[PDB]
Enzyme design. Structure first.
Site, short mmCIF file in Angstrom:
data_model
loop_
_atom_site.label_atom_id
_atom_site.label_comp_id
_atom_site.label_asym_id
_atom_site.label_seq_id
_atom_site.Cartn_x
_atom_site.Cartn_y
_atom_site.Cartn_z
N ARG A 158 0.80 -1.22 0.00
CA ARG A 158 0.00 0.00 0.00
C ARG A 158 0.84 1.28 0.00
O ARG A 158 0.42 2.29 -0.57
CB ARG A 158 -0.92 0.01 1.23
CG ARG A 158 -2.28 -0.63 1.02
CD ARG A 158 -2.22 -2.16 1.03
NE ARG A 158 -3.54 -2.76 1.19
CZ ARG A 158 -4.01 -3.26 2.33
NH1 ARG A 158 -3.27 -3.25 3.43
NH2 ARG A 158 -5.23 -3.79 2.37
N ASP A 197 -9.39 1.96 -9.34
CA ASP A 197 -8.23 1.25 -9.82
C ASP A 197 -7.20 1.05 -8.71
O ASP A 197 -7.01 1.93 -7.87
CB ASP A 197 -7.60 2.04 -10.97
CG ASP A 197 -6.23 1.51 -11.36
OD1 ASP A 197 -6.13 0.84 -12.42
OD2 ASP A 197 -5.27 1.77 -10.62
N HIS A 201 -3.85 -1.58 -3.52
CA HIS A 201 -2.66 -0.77 -3.23
C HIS A 201 -2.98 0.48 -2.43
O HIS A 201 -2.15 1.38 -2.28
CB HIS A 201 -1.97 -0.45 -4.56
CG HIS A 201 -1.55 -1.68 -5.30
ND1 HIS A 201 -0.42 -2.40 -4.97
CD2 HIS A 201 -2.15 -2.36 -6.31
CE1 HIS A 201 -0.34 -3.47 -5.74
NE2 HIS A 201 -1.38 -3.47 -6.56
N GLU A 233 -11.14 -2.16 -7.52
CA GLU A 233 -10.35 -3.16 -8.21
C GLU A 233 -9.36 -3.78 -7.25
O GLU A 233 -8.34 -3.18 -6.91
CB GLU A 233 -9.58 -2.56 -9.40
CG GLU A 233 -8.90 -3.65 -10.24
CD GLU A 233 -7.60 -3.20 -10.89
OE1 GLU A 233 -7.15 -2.06 -10.64
OE2 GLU A 233 -7.03 -3.99 -11.66
N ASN A 298 -11.32 -8.79 -18.36
CA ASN A 298 -11.28 -7.34 -18.27
C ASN A 298 -10.16 -6.79 -19.15
O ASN A 298 -9.43 -7.56 -19.76
CB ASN A 298 -11.17 -6.87 -16.80
CG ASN A 298 -9.75 -6.88 -16.26
OD1 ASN A 298 -8.86 -7.52 -16.82
ND2 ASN A 298 -9.53 -6.16 -15.16
N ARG A 337 -20.59 -7.22 -15.56
CA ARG A 337 -19.96 -6.25 -16.45
C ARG A 337 -19.51 -6.94 -17.73
O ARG A 337 -18.74 -7.91 -17.68
CB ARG A 337 -18.74 -5.59 -15.80
CG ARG A 337 -17.99 -4.65 -16.75
CD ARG A 337 -16.76 -4.03 -16.11
NE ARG A 337 -15.72 -5.03 -15.87
CZ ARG A 337 -14.67 -4.83 -15.09
NH1 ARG A 337 -14.50 -3.67 -14.47
NH2 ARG A 337 -13.78 -5.80 -14.93
#
Ligand SMILES: *[C@@H]1O[C@@](F)(CO)[C@@H](O[C@H]2O[C@H](CO)[C@@H](O[C@H]3O[C@H](CO)[C@@H](OC)[C@H](O)[C@H]3O)[C@H](O)[C@H]2O)[C@H](O)[C@H]1O
Ligand SMILES: CO[C@H]1[C@H](O)[C@@H](O)[C@@H](O[C@H]2[C@H](O)[C@@H](O)[C@@H](F)O[C@@H]2CO)O[C@@H]1CO
Ligand SMILES: [Ca+2]
Ligand SMILES: [Cl-]
Length: 496
Positions: A158, A197, A201, A233, A298, A337
């Site tokens: 992170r 996105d 992280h 995500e 994706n 999706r």
């Protein structure tokens, strides 16, 4: 936070990957609205680095320079135009929010950006935001390289740079505020939600802090109190300290286990079989259905850039792909999706596609317009899977069976299965190397139904296969392993 905010009756969103704003606006009016699509996930609308080596790769859009709505997809005027036109037709817009980082730390300083904004990765200076050295985690990261090196350490994942991407200090209110300013700009314009996105992280707490500053949806189109749809995500295939469940307090999460496992099953890898899908969903270790954003493939993993591996099915695997998508759209688990991609010169060498960086169809770097062929397919190298009859009709199938329970499951212990949704729909699949001819219980009222895979229901008539359901709800299905599409689907609105 967890509701898609789509119009009642619309249950899916489509990723119009690298599409220009003007093209999406038209698609909303001419196709998405009439076909019942719930919304569109757009590529990052914020200014990004213009990379010429390689030539304008698709991933350059994931290297932010500023929050100006200025990209190869269009300017702010064109973006607003699109959001307004789509919303006016009942089709929502979801923004791919790149807020965990800015561009690569090795990128050269200058004005090589989609809006000419100046930036200097080396000095951590992004004046168009503005961001400075004080706004990055350079001093927080504890790895020797400054980049993420070990996923077993939840902290560096992170606080360190993802493959060199400058990591924003999301703990700072200033940074949180600059991101909120950008997202609120979009929400006020009319966006219904966001794809976060690289959420893995980012600290769950930091994401929440940012979401806390977000406005409710534009009251001109959405009822008061409507919260933006959030789907983070998070790539979690298990085996790591970080779990996608750590992000349930902020919204939904992408379930990458979904497409990976479905691909392995449809491909019949390691002895897997469709008969095993009877308990599809949480039973396979997936996140709760109300927190899942599912998909077969994706923009990342369809070109080997994401989780799932070589098992991921894509438009390149047309026949199996249509079946996987059909199964997903028919099954009640999660929010679906659909992927919409472009064609590229896939060149496999030593198991890897050396052209996986190629950007969208273009002329000297200018993204090509999406042209529509008389047969409703797309030209200019746009695949437009969402326009494939087999996929478009399954998108409608999901709408029709919305709310109906998973029932009347059947399987031959191998790769021939079938199931229904309450009394509104039924689907049959044959992924075995032999024909499937048997009478099954559909749970559907008596009548003649048009198979929406092989055809359509036009003026009280079926263009493809026809299924006859008797008074007992039973119906005979026949699918040869040599059929173009080895699966049949019928629903309440396909009945004659
Ligand atoms: C989410 O945002 C991402 F950036 C991270 O998951 C997307 O990743 C893709 O874009 C990046 C950025 O262009 C790309 O990495 C390129 O740039 C870095 C930085 O200089 C290079 O490292 C030295 C790397 O080799 C480049 O390829 C990723 O490879 C690409 O997958 C991601 O798709 C989004 O979902
Ligand atoms: C009018 O064309 C239809 C076509 O009949 C249908 O089969 C499908 O075509 C896909 C096909 O399924 C897929 O396997 C691959 F060949 O791509 C084509 C589209 O390029 O859809 C079209 C349009 O509805
Ligand atoms: Ca980070
Ligand atoms: Cl995703």
């Amino acid at each position: 936070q967890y509701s898609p905010n789509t119009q009642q009756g619309r249950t899916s969103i489509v990723h119009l990957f690298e599409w220009r704003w003007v093209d999406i606006a038209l698609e909303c009016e001419r196709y998405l609205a009439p076909k019942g699509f719930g919304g569109v996930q757009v590529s990052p609308p914020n200014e990004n680095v213009a990379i010429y080596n390689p030539f304008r790769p698709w991933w350059e859009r994931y290297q932010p320079v500023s929050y100006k709505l200025c990209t190869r997809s269009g300017n702010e005027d064109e973006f607003r135009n699109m959001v307004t036109r789509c919303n006016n037709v009942g089709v929502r817009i979801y923004v791919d929010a790149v807020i965990n980082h800015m561009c690569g730390n090795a990128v050269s300083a200058g004005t090589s950006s989609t809006c000419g904004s100046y930036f200097n990765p080396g000095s951590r200076d992004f004046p168009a935001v503005p961001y400075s050295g004080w706004d990055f985690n350079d001093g927080k990261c504890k790895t020797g390289s400054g980049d993420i090196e070990n996923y077993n350490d939840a902290t560096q994942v992170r606080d360190c740079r993802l493959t060199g991407l400058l990591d924003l200090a999301l703990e700072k209110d200033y940074v949180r505020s600059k991101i909120a300013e950008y997202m609120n700009h979009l929400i006020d314009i009319g966006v219904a939600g966001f794809r976060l996105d690289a959420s893995k992280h980012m600290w769950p707490g930091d994401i929440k802090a940012i979401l806390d500053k977000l406005h409710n949806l534009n009251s001109n189109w959405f009822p008061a109190g409507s919260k933006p749809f959030i789907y983070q995500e998070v790539i979690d295939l298990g085996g790591e300290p970080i779990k996608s469940s750590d992000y349930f307090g902020n919204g939904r999460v992408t379930e990458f286990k979904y497409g990976a496992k479905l691909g392995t099953v449809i491909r019949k890898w390691n002895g897997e079989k469709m008969s095993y899908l009877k308990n599809w969903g949480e039973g396979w270790g997936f996140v709760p259905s109300d927190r899942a954003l599912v998909f077969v493939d994706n923009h990342d993993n369809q070109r080997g850039h994401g989780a799932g591996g070589a098992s991921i099915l894509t438009f390149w695997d047309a026949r199996l792909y249509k079946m996987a998508v059909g199964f997903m759209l028919a099954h009640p688990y999660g929010f679906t999706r659909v992927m919409s991609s472009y064609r590229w010169p896939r060149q496999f060498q030593n198991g890897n596609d050396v052209n996986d960086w190629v950007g969208p169809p273009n002329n000297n770097g200018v993204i090509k317009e999406v042209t529509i062929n008389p047969d409703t397919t797309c030209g200019n190298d746009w695949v437009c899977e969402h326009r494939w009859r087999q996929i478009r009709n399954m998108v409608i199938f999901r709408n029709v069976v919305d709310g109906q329970p998973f029932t009347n499951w059947y399987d031959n212990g191998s790769n021939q299965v079938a199931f229904g949704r309450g009394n509104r729909g039924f689907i049959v699949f044959n992924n075995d190397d032999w024909s499937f001819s048997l009478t099954l219980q559909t749970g559907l009222p008596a009548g003649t139904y048009c198979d929406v895979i092989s055809g359509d229901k036009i003026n009280g008539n079926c263009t493809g296969i026809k299924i006859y359901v008797s008074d007992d709800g039973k119906a005979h299905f026949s699918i040869s392993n040599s059929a173009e599409d080895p699966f049949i689907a019928i629903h309440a609105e396909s009945k004659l």
